[PDB]
Amino acid sequence: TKDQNGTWEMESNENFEGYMKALDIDFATRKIAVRLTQTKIIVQDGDNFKTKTNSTFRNYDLDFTVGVEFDEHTKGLDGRNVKTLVTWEGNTLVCVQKGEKENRGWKQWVEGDKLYLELTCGDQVCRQVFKKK
Amino acid sequence: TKDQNGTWEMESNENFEGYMKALDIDFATRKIAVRLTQTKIIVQDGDNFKTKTNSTFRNYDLDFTVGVEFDEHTKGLDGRNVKTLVTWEGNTLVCVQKGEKENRGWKQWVEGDKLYLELTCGDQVCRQVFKKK
Numbered sequence: 001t002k003d004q005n006g007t008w009e010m011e012s013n014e015n016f017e018g019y020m021k022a023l024d025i026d027f028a029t030r031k032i033a034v035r036l037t038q039t040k041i042i043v044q045d046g047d048n049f050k051t052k053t054n055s056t057f058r059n060y061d062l063d064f065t066v067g068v069e070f071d072e073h074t075k076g077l078d079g080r081n082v083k084t085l086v087t088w089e090g091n092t093l094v095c096v097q098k099g100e101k102e103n104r105g106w107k108q109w110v111e112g113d114k115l116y117l118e119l120t121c122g123d124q125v126c127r128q129v130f131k132k133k
Numbered sequence: 134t135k136d137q138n139g140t141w142e143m144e145s146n147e148n149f150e151g152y153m154k155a156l157d158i159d160f161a162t163r164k165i166a167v168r169l170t171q172t173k174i175i176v177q178d179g180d181n182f183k184t185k186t187n188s189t190f191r192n193y194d195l196d197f198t199v200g201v202e203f204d205e206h207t208k209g210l211d212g213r214n215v216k217t218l219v220t221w222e223g224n225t226l227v228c229v230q231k232g233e234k235e236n237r238g239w240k241q242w243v244e245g246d247k248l249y250l251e252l253t254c255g256d257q258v259c260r261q262v263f264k265k266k
Contacts, residue, residue: 001201047180047200067180067200067220068134085220087200 002091003044004108008115008130010038019119019126023078023101033057040115040130049086072097135224136177137241141248141263143171152252152259156211156234165190173248173263182219205230 013036020030035055043050047066052059058076064086072084074097082099089107096105106119119126146167153163169188176183180199185192191209197219205217207230215232222240229238234254241250252259 065134069220069222087202087218087220089202 001088002110004042004049004093004110004115005044006042006115007133008040008042009133010036010040010128011114011131012127012129013038014127015124016119016126016128018124019121020077022121022124025078038128038130039133040117066093134221135226135243137175137182137226137243137248138177139175140266141173141175142266143173143261143263144247145260145262146171147260148257149259149261151257152254153210155254155257158211171261171263173250199226 013034016034017030020033025033035057038053038055041052041054048063049066050063052061060076064070064084066086066088069083069085072082074080074082080099080101082097082101082104084095084097086093086095088094092107092109094105094107098104101121103123104121106117108115108117110116113132115130115132117128117130119128150163150167153166158166166188169190172187174185174187181196182199183196185194193209195205197203197217199219199221202216202218205215207213207215213232213234215230215234215237217228217230219226219228221227225240225242227238227240231237236256237254239250239252241248243249246265248263248265250261250263252261
């Protein structure tokens with residue numbers, strides 16, 4: 001369990017295209033989706049997380065409590081319904097999104113002044129690194 | 134998420150024999166264990182649980198935080214090592230104990246003044262009901 005509070009600015013974004021393609025996001029949207037400057041702001045008070053992921057293309061905003069299962073409607077990305085659970089595995093925040101897509105979820109951890117995020121769907125992995133602002 | 138604090142006295146215990154047999158507990162321990170009354174004490178503050186399951190023969194203490202994965206050594210039962218995770222699925226507390234035994238875990242919920250606990254291992258289900266004191 002560890003502190004992830006802050007404003008985080010993207011410095012690296014690997015294979016976001018493969019990730020979206022595994023989610024069957026159409027070609028035209030993928031071409032305008034891959035933003036290289038992105039800000040993630042996280043407010044974490046105990047088990048409650050309030051996050052905003054902002055780019056010039058679109059914003060995703062996600063609120064959740066660690067250990068409480070919830071239904072997520074992935075509107076604005078692939079628009080599927082999934083049952084999501086976020087828990088701690090040591091100091092790594094782990095999310096599983098159960099539904100039609102195998103191996104769908106993400107892992108997020110802070111190491112020094114950087115936040116690392118791995119997004120997975122099937123056999124695709126996208127890795128992003130952010131620096132605390 | 135819901136409140137499960139209190140001292141609970143066992144009312145009913147169905148198929149506890151089958152559950153222990155699926156865990157390979159020896160016949161002589163099973164004969165003694167199946168006839169005993171159990172008292173469960175739960176102290177819950179937020180996501181941290183401190184629990185005691187007591188009988189005249191043997192007791193089992195177990196503390197955990199909801200949504201935090203941990204290593205459980207099931208000492209005094211079958212003595213195996215399992216990775217345990219307890220989460221909320223509505224107002225049911227759900228536990229998965231990952232390891233050699235398939236479908237091992239439990240679900241616990243409160244309806245008024247009774248606590249219901251369903252324990253699973255393989256294809257065996259044990260149903261227990263307690264009443265608050």
